[PDB]
């Protein structure tokens, strides 16, 4: 579970996922990458599921990079509570994924395992994923 | 590619031009263990069994300015058994082996700038 060690403000305003791609747009560490086609809020739980999926379907020498990180937190008012009396408490951490951000990349193992590995990582995420390669 | 095919047809045509005896066989029901046995029993560089393409064999035959072998290489499975110097002992050896086999056909061949029939192959041994 990726989580910031400390934050200046417990309850920040939510960060929109509507828009184009700011950074993390092109594969630059590996050479195959999992691009998104639909901006959405995905939490650290989905990252851990996807990362564990990649590691289980990886080999003995494959290497991976996680680009996105859940910087922003979100709150949730307790159940059966009427509106008012302040904002709720932080519950889960979410990374802001915009349309076009490369979430996972893999390298150093043959192409078929890498294509399969990215597929299982993207089935764990709500965004509509797509495979891309690194420019020569 | 085309250049390799051109090279292949040229060298097989040269080999059949400098050779003296040829006989055609089929590849129906004999084992690879048996195939290695035929190679060792011959053991002569003049005698050589080879799988040739039907198309490549006819085209090399056109370059060999021979005639009449066309009926052999039509709608059939073709082997090449080239013999240098003495070919009677090679034909005798292959005839003994097909008798030791279960079933076999045997198609007309070419030797001494003359052609033979099926019965003429039976007596050529």
């Amino acid at each position: 579970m990726l989580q910031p060690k400390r934050t200046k403000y417990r309850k920040p305003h939510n960060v929109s996922y509507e828009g184009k791609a700011k950074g993390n747009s092109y594969v630059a560490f590996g050479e195959y990458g999992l691009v998104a086609t639909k901006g959405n809020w995905i939490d650290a739980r989905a990252i851990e599921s996807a990362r564990i999926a990649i590691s289980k379907c990886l080999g003995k020498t494959g290497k991976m990079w996680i680009r996105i990180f859940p910087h922003m937190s979100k709150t949730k008012k307790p159940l059966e509570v009427r509106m008012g009396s302040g904002k709720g408490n932080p519950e889960f951490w979410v990374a802001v994924v915009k349309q076009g951000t490369v979430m996972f990349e893999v390298a150093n193992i043959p192409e078929s395992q890498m294509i399969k590995a990215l597929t299982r990582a993207g089935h764990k995420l709500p965004v509509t994923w797509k495979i891309l390669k690194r420019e020569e | 590619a085309k250049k390799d095919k051109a090279q292949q047809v040229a060298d097989v045509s040269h080999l059949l031009s400098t050779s003296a005896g040829f006989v055609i066989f089929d590849y129906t029901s004999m084992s690879a263990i048996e195939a290695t046995s035929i190679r060792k029993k011959l053991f002569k560089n003049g005698s050589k069994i080879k799988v040739i393409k039907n198309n490549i064999l006819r085209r090399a035959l056109k370059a060999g300015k021979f005639e009449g072998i066309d009926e052999t290489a039509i709608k059939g499975k073709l082997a090449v058994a080239v013999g240098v110097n003495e070919i009677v002992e090679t034909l005798k050896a292959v005839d003994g082996v097909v008798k030791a086999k279960e079933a076999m056909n045997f198609v007309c061949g070419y030797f001494d700038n003359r052609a033979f029939n099926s019965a003429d192959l039976e007596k050529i041994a």
Partner: protein, 128 residues
Amino acid sequence: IAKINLLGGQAKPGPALASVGINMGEFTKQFNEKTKDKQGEMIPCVITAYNDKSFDFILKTTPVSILLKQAAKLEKGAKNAKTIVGKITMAKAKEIAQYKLVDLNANTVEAALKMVLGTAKQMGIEVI
């Protein structure tokens, strides 16, 4: 056709043969008669199982890579291919090749030479 495993000094048992109709008791003498030159060594037999009943049998050489162990002066080879322990020269390799030429289907003796390297690479023995 059956490739059956029978000891050279003890080949009288074996019920599987009896299922095909082979005359086991008459043929026991034939099994033991031509293996006394290699007593103690384990020698399997190929059987031309058929209904003619005149079953022609052929003996067979003990499996390879045990003389490699004997020549390498070690009991068991390395558990890692990269790790090299045994070394074998061309003279020991060629004695094995002319020994094993009988069971091999190679036409030439250099083909049998590079058989020794091929099983030695599996065994991990450097070819020097």
